[PDB]
Amino acid sequence: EHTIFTQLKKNIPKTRYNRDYMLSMANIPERIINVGVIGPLHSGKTSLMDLLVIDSHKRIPDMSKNVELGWKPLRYLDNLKQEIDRGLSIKLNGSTLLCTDLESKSRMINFLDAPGHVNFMDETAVALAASDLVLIVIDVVEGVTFVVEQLIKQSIKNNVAMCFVINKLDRLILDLKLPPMDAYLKLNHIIANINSFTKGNVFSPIDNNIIFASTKLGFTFTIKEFVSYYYAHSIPSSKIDDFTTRLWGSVYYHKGNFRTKPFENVEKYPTFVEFILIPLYKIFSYALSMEKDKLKNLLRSNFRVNLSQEALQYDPQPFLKHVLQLIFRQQTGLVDAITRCYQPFELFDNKTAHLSIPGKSTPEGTLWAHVLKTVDYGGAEWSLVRIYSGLLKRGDTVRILDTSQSESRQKRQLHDEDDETPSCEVEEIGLLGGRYVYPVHEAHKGQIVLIKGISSAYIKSATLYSVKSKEDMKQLKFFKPLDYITEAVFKIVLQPLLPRELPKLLDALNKISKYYPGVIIKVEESGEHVILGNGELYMDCLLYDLRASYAKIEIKISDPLTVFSESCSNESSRLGEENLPGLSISVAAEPMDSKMIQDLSRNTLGKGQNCLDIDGIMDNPRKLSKILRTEYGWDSLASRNVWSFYNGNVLINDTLPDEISPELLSKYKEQIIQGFYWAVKEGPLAEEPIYGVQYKLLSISVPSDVNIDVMKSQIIPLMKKACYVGLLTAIPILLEPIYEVDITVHAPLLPIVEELMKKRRGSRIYKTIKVAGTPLLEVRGQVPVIESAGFETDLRLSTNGLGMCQLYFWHKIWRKVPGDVLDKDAFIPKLKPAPINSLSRDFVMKTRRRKGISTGGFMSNDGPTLEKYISAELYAQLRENGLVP
Amino acid sequence: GIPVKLLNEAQGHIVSLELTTGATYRGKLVESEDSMNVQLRDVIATEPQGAVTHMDQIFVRGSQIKFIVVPDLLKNAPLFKKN
Amino acid sequence: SKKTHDMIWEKLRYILQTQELSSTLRESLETLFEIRQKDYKSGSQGLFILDPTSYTVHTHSYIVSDEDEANKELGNFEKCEN
Amino acid sequence: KKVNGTSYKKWSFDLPEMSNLYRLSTPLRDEVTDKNYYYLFDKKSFFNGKALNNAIPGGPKFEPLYPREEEEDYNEFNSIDRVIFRVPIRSEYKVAFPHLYNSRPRSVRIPWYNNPVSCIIQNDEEYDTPALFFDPSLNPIPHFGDFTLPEDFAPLLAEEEELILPNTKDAMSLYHSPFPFNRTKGKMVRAQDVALAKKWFLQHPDEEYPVKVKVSYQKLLKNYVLNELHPTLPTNHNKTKLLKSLKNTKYFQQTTIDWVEAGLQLCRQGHNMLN
Amino acid sequence: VSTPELKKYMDKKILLNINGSRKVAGILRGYDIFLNVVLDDAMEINGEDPANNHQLGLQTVIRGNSIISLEALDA
RNA sequence: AAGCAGCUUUACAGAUCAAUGGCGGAGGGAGGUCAACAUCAAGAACUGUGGGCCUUUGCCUAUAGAACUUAUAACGAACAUGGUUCUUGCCUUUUACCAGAACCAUCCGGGUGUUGUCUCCAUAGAAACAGGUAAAGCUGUCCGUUACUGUGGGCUUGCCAUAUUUUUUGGAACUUUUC
Ligand SMILES: Nc1nc2c(ncn2[C@@H]2O[C@H](COP(=O)(O)OP(=O)(O)OP(=O)(O)O)[C@@H](O)[C@H]2O)c(=O)[nH]1
Ligand SMILES: [Mg+2]
Ligand SMILES: [Mg+2]
């Protein structure tokens, strides 16, 4: 009902190697490497794992007669039942394989294919943190689309090597029917398009960074593999390394000598066309058309390849796959690219310094591992872990710290004792194997394994350490919470259909928050349950497992919603006051700069090869005042008195008692900021987060007498009340998230897409790229997330299947909702979409009634108003001037 | 040839190399080349007359080596099979 | 004349991809390719007053390699004893 | 060589014979090569529209799977002052994502997501157009003594001079063709089992058809869904067939006669039975 | 054919034994495919460390044929 | 891959013309709108064989073989009917019906695996002998070329550079103590 999975040990498929020699290679850290397979939607990633699994194993019981032939793929690493039905990877999966390169050096390689759909961009952030090098699989037709660009930008960010797989070369000949020079210009266009995004490293088929593949026909090759099979016999052995460099890149060959210019009097192609593409297209042509007796002689004469008597009575697609698998014999050129690209001396210290804090290398006595995610792998709850130091055996006891706690634990590690971390026992260790788990007694350094018995100690990620001495605990590093790229911004509110089934819902929602790491599950004060998701497909995959796999209950579910953010348009006798006169705190608000907001969304503050990350942004206050004054042009006083950057927001101390007694403020500073955190999390308008508001603490009053006990506990609710008075006075607005859209349609069907973008509300097409060589073109635009309900299927039905869009939230575009948020006279029509001037009033009033903050009979409007916080006698004074409505 | 290929299999594996000068270097293998010159880490060195020392890193020219001892497990290494 | 015309495109297509071209000229060249998929529906409107059998089909088969008699002289004045 | 023998099973053809049958069959073939045409018109969406009691605009209409629907809970959950109204949730939204746009879906089946956007260039105007040809509507591609090998060193397949063979344009039409024309061998099927008209109502008709024949497309789809939804599997122990067990008896003999002769006998015999 | 990989060592003080008996320790600047190694500030080590030691020259080059083993004293 | 060598065979002239060793041979090939018997929907699932535990079963471990059917799940790229029960529809009673469900069946069909039969085409035997099963060169004995050459074909081969620092065109040679 959930997966397909071989439970029996005796039915696990045997391998060509003996699998104990593979685990013997786990002892050497340099021997083993971790490559994770990423790419766009339907790029051929799981099919690339089909080629690596069935050539590692001798007989797979799940492979059928249609699958042994060409007709249907073995999506072996799509073991989930929903993944079989969707035709789609959903969960991260992997298989550990022993693989030899072109120099026949066998080594243990841990593969992990990420799902390529853009709503599962949380699963590939696990694959970016696990892997030493990413094997980015690109289809040749769509080329370098905008989701390819981010997968190049993320791999540079994660300090991870990369190696590009150009896939689907059958579509380049069988679908598109390009002439061989016209397809060489296609391949040269894509490689020149990935070299602009890899800002340092040049990528080229000479440099063994690029592998050509057509995975439905089941082959892959570099140009180094192809020379070493069929051209190394003819030319001298000192020439094979210089010949393969004269192979790509506008250099021509005729009768024994090479030129950059074209030969006169001779119709001649480049050396890549004549030596590789012309031999490849003849294999495509002759396996489909040439007689099987005449073709059998050409495969012995040129490829030394014997066609079987059973293979000649094949259908044209299995016969084309059988020839292309009997040429291009193994994936030794893929593995040689994975071997030659990864350099652990350059990258593994920077990769560890990016997942945790930068420091010296931990000693080998420390066991130290990174728990990537919790995996529901084969009817059990496993933990996906990567070991960075030490040795872990089955039955040991380890200290497992949840990563959300690791911000404070790393900060409290400095110290200018006991009960620090819960302890769980390593119940069982296995290797992920696709449709099975292979049990192992221990797990060495550098390899991804699956451990049962860890998952209860944490949510959504963990760090695993087992330290020997207390002095050795001082130097261990804690990992940072995982950078899932897309923010969970697509919102669904649910409750169970029956009230007595609520504990079974809360049990299943705690599983989904573990299993789906890019979700944000929260419980409102009204008792409803909010799930924040990535898209329509990410919610539909989530709510399948919630209704079928993890709780058998039926649940009520609202329409798609979004998260809103709160902000202001201008800066604004401004004071705040408690019923007791002992506390008087005045707070002003101001919009932050657009460049200052856009850089804090990129998680780092700076410009031009000088930037300060948000984690150590307090630890250099002299340098922070240099960055704020130079790059954005703030005042010198405002640069020195900034207290904290909470998410998208800033607090500045601007008061005269700070010039009088800053030490009296410094003992109360940590709880003003704690109360500042208590106000940004739920703002004054609709209990929504605050984004892009420059707070200025104007004044603060300290009562006669001091109580740490009472003054400490009273200022935290009052500062949250005082931040509301500053924002509401400062012409508040409502923000909405903006999906970016990546449409692929055929070129005649573009005016359908332009009219389809006009039916939505805040949609605009910004860029229209002619995807070269293809009939289709790439359309890049934007849409609000509250408007993008059924956007994906309105596009497909209107273009009759020749259109597809990816909706994503990489860039954190928050845009002002077009209405005015304080409109008592806004016309909200029932059952119809309200007009464009009524939008900020509508979205707040409905949100305040989901939360229960505003309670009406049917529709009673008590707006977010500046009178329940400030005194009512002052509110009447604000009406007569025209400042407050 | 297979014998050198096997040396690549040795890589990262505690291996013992006897020089034609008579010494014995047992330790981990950092790198190897088709020439066969081998460089080791944490080698325990035995001079020809038996005096034993310990050296952090080492490189030995291929021509010098008389024989190499490699991990016993390597024997069932995948490449070896004739067919 | 589809067959020879297609040959004109194929040489024309060889211009853009395998050869280097001045920029402003080049964008106009690929626009022609764009119209080609778009099928020419904005080069096909005009004053077809005459039916295809009301225009007497004097399709003059003259080649731009023929010295063509440059008859400026009948636009001069003369003297008809006719 | 084309069949096993006069038992007439397991045929196998060559490429020119297979493309020739492909060309004769173009009145009755499928004429659709992408699976993105059948997006909300496959049988998984047809099962969901029955289970959710929705109507695809060309698909069939059924009875409610759960006709006890009119019960409701008086609650503040789905009220109008709660719901933001931006996009009307269509029935195509409910079927594409059955677990998102449906409160309480049950007996629904997970649909297939997209396939990659099929860009298959076919060429039908001229036989003399080559098999590999830079077709119009393709976007153009705008871009941009030291070492010596011995002479008569050649690339692979250099002794074979031509890339396009005279059957390649035929064979690539067959490669992207639906079943059974992409095959060259296969088992025999019965004359009952060759559904020539099944592919017509599995497609959208067109807007041009009248209303009495668009019902015939919907009503034949409804019989298609109910056969797929309720499989009746055959049991294996049925080893006694009727004609085989009467052949074993001495009271039945065998010959070959004409069909019209055997029809006239069965009319004479069946008249003699009822009379 | 293939260049020996000394790449990490270069710029590090190295001891190496040459041919029959001799041991020479010096900073290493260059290596080639035959292993010919050129190092600066060369010193010929002997039994008595300060005494019998004599420097060779500002730059010394070594034929790769006489190298028996190379050990780098340093990081 | 031309050419040379190695290998495998081959028309063979052989050595032996023995004891040998290798491969082949010790009752065919294609079929049939022929038949019988198994088998065809399940922890992604099978069976034989060896070893250990408990006391045969079961488990663990080692190994060999897996035809057909199946992943947008099913022998059938096809598609009818019946029974019961629940809920509706038609609205004199019943039958025959309406159209959804749940559980079961019948009917038209299909694959594969052995064995028997039938039809057509067959002839080198050394297809000679002795044992026995549910099956057979299954085993022993055995015979054909033959295990060691040269000519003629093929390649599981050479790494196409064969003396000038990491391998095979020599840093070799000589003398001395102890025991
Ligand atoms: N023509 C052609 N089609 C291919 C090729 N590789 C895969 N496909 C098809 O493309 C679809 C996508 O392939 P997948 O194996 O699912 O690759 P994927 O990137 O893992 O897809 P996701 O699950 O979304 O991540 C498959 O249904 C294949 O049929 C190829 O090399 N050539
Ligand atoms: Mg995938
Ligand atoms: Mg009666």
Helix (H, G, I), strand (E, B) or coil at D81: coil
CA distance C22 to D215: 60
Collect all residues of chain E within an 8 Å Cβ-Cβ radius of residue B57.
Answer: 71-72
Half-sphere CA count of A476, side-chain side, radius 13 A: 27
Looking from the CA of residue A171, the nearest atom of ligand 1 is: 1
Contacts of residue A561, Cβ cutoff 8 Å, sequence gap at least 6? A491, A492, A493, A786, A850, D84
Among D10, D11, A751, which residue's Cα sits nearest to residue D2? D11
| A116 labeled binding residue | yes
Residue nearest to nucleotide F166 (CA to C1'): B63
Closest CA to A520 of A506, A510, A533: A533
Q: Supply the CATH number for residue E37's domain.
A: 2.30.30.100
- Report the alpha-carbon distance of residue E2 to residue E30 in Å, rounded: 15
Which single residue has its CA nearest the C1' atom of nucleotide F37?
Answer: D239
CB contact, 8 Å: C37 with chain A? yes
Phi-psi region of D131 (alpha: psi -120 to 50; beta: other; left: phi over 0): alpha
φ, ψ at D273 (rounded to 5°): -75, -50
State yes or no: A43 annotated in a binding site: yes
Half-sphere exposure at residue D120, Cβ-oriented, CA atoms within 13 angstroms = 17
- How far apart are alpha carbons D217 and D215 in whole angstroms? 5
Whole-number Å distance, alpha carbon D134 to ligand 3 midpoint, is 83
Using a CB-CB distance cutoff of 8 angstroms, which residues of chain A are in contact with residue B77?
Answer: 21, 106
Ligand 1 pocket residue status of A43, Cβ below 6 Å: yes
- Residues from chain C contacting residue A181 (CB–CB below 8 Å): 18
User: Domain range for residue E70?
Assistant: 1-75
What residue of B is the nearest CA neighbor of A56? Answer: B78
Distance A382 CA to ligand 2 centre (A): 20
C82 CA to centre of ligand 2 in angstroms:
92
Q: Which nucleotide is nearest to D231 (CA to C1')?
A: F79
Q: What span, in angstroms and rounded, lies between the C-alpha atoms of A241 and A254?
A: 19
Q: Do C16 and D141 lie within an 8 Å CB cutoff? A: yes
C-contacting residues in D 88-127 (Cβ below 8 Å)? 126
Whether residue B61 and residue E64 make contact (CB cut-off 8 A), yes or no, is yes
The answer to whether A252 and A263 are in contact (CB under 8 A) is: yes
Indicate the CATH number for domain A487-563.
3.30.70.870
Rounded CA–C1' distance between D196 and F42, in angstroms = 35
Q: D3 touching A, CB under 8 A?
A: no
D142 lines ligand 1 (CB under 6 A): no
Asked if residue A460 lies in contact with residue A384, where contact means CB atoms within 8 angstroms, the answer is no
Q: How far is E67 from chain B (nearest CA, A)?
A: 7
Contact status of D136 with chain C (Cβ, < 8 Å): yes
* Distance, Å, A81 CA → F44 C1': 12
> Residue A759: enclosing H or E segment and its boundaries?
helix A750-759
The DSSP element (H or E) to which D218 belongs, if any, is helix D211-229
Which CATH number does the domain housing residue B35 bear?
2.30.30.100
Q: Which residues have CB under 8 Å from A685's CB, separation 6+?
A: A564, A566, A732, A734, A821, A844, A864
How many A from CA of A53 to the centre of ligand 3? 75
DSSP letters of A237-304? TTTHHHHTTSSSSS-EEETTEEESSPPTTS---BHHIIIIIHHHHHHHHHHHSS-HHHHHHHHHHHS-
Q: Is the CB of A389 under 6 A from ligand 1?
A: no
Q: How far apart are CA A791 and CA A806, in angstroms?
A: 10
C27 touches chain A (CB under 8 A): no
Judge contact between A381 and A407, C-beta under 8 A: no
Whether A781 lines ligand 1, by a CB cut-off of 6 Å, is no
- Counting from 1 in the atom list of ligand 1, the atom nearest the Cα of A49 is 15
Write the single-letter amino acid at A789.
A
Q: Separation of A197 CA from ligand 2 center, angstroms?
A: 24
Is A168 annotated as a binding-site member? yes
* Contacts across the C-D interface (CB distance below 8 Å): 27
Relative orientation angle of helices D168-175 and A278-288, to the nearest 10 degrees: 80
Structure tokens at D107: 């007996």
| Length A120 CA → F92 C1' (Å) | 65
Domain range annotation of chain A: 1-222+329-357, 223-328, 358-486, 487-563, 564-570+732-852, 573-731
User: Which residue in this structure is represented by tokens 């026949």?
Assistant: A104
Grouping H, G, I as helix, E, B as strand and the rest as coil, residue D258 is coil
**A597 residue type, one letter:** I
Instruction: Give the residue among D53, D62, D58, D29 at the shortest CA–CA distance from D42.
Output: D58
DSSP per-residue string spanning A464-508:
EEE-SSTTTTTT--PBPPP--SS---EEEEEEESSGGGHHHHHHH
Type of residue found at A487: E
Q: Do C13 and D140 touch (CB under 8 A)?
A: yes
Name the β-bridge partners of B45: B25, B53
Query: Atom 12 (ligand 1): residue with closest C-alpha?
Result: A42
Q: How many domains does chain B have?
A: 1
For the Cβ of A694 lying below 6 angstroms from any atom of ligand 1, the answer is: no
Looking at the structure of chain E, the number of domains it has is 1
Give chain F positions with protein CB within 7 A: 1, 30-37, 39-41, 43-47, 60-61, 63-64, 66, 68-81, 87, 99-102, 104-112, 155-157, 159-161, 165-167
Give the N- to C-terminal CA distance of chain A in Å, as an integer: 59
In A337-458, at which residue ranges do the beta strands (DSSP E only) sit? 367-375, 382-389, 392-393, 397-402, 423-425, 428-432, 437-439, 442-443, 448-452
Q: Is C18 in Cβ contact with A747 (below 8 Å)?
A: no
Helix A278-288, helix A316-326: angle, nearest 10: 140
- CB-based contact, C36 to chain A, within 8 Å: no
Token digits of residue B45: 């060195």
To one decimal, the resolution in angstroms is 3.2
Question: What is the CA(A620)–ligand 3 centre distance, in A?
Answer: 102
Q: Virtual CA dihedral for A118, A120, A126, A131, nearest 10 degrees?
A: -50
* Interface membership of C19 toward A (CB under 8 Å): no
Answer for the pair A266, A254: CB distance below 8 angstroms, yes or no: yes
Q: Would you say D50 and D95 are in contact if contact means Cβ atoms under 8 Å apart?
A: no
Sequence-distant (≥ 6) Cβ neighbours of residue A772 within 8 angstroms:
A143, A186, A189, D139, D140, D141, D142
Query: Could you give the 3-state DSSP secondary structure of residue C17?
Result: helix
A44 is in an annotated binding site: yes
Which own/partner pairs from B38-45 qualify as long-range (CB within 8 Å, at least 24 positions apart)? B38/B7, B38/B62, B38/B65, B38/B68, B39/E5, B39/E70, B40/B15
Q: Touching B: which chains, 3+ CB pairs < 8 A?
A: A, E
Beta bridge partners of residue A254, listed in sequence order: A257
Closest Cα to residue C33, out of D139, A466, A58?
A: D139
User: Using the beta-carbon criterion (under 8 Å), do E68 and B58 form an inter-chain contact?
Assistant: no
Nearest ligand 1 atom, CA A90? 23
Nearest by CB to E69, from B33, B35, B64: name it: B64
- Can you give the distance from the CA of residue B16 to the C1' of nucleotide F51 in angstroms? 37
Q: Is A117 in the pocket of ligand 1 (CB under 6 A)?
A: yes
CA-based nearest distance D15→chain C, Å: 28
Nearest nt (C1') from D43 Cα: F72
Q: Ligand 1 within 6 A of A541 CB?
A: no
- Enter the tokens of residue A363: 């000693």
Q: How far is B9 from chain A (nearest CA, A)?
A: 6
Residues of chain A positioned with their CB less than 8 A from the CB of C38: 747-748
Q: Which residue has the tokens 């007989």?
A: A59
| Range(s) of the domain holding residue B12 | 1-83
Residues from chain E contacting residue B19 (CB–CB below 8 Å): 68-69
- Across the interface, whether the CB atoms of C17 and A182 are under 8 A apart is answered yes
Q: Which two tokens stand for residue C40?
A: 């020419």
Q: Is D137 on the interface with C (CB under 8 A)?
A: yes
Q: Which residue of B has its CA nearest to A22?
A: B77
Say whether C27 sits in a helix, a strand or coil: helix
One-letter amino acid for residue A275 of the chain:
F
Q: Which among A693, A698, A706 is positioned nearest to A664, based on CA atoms?
A: A706
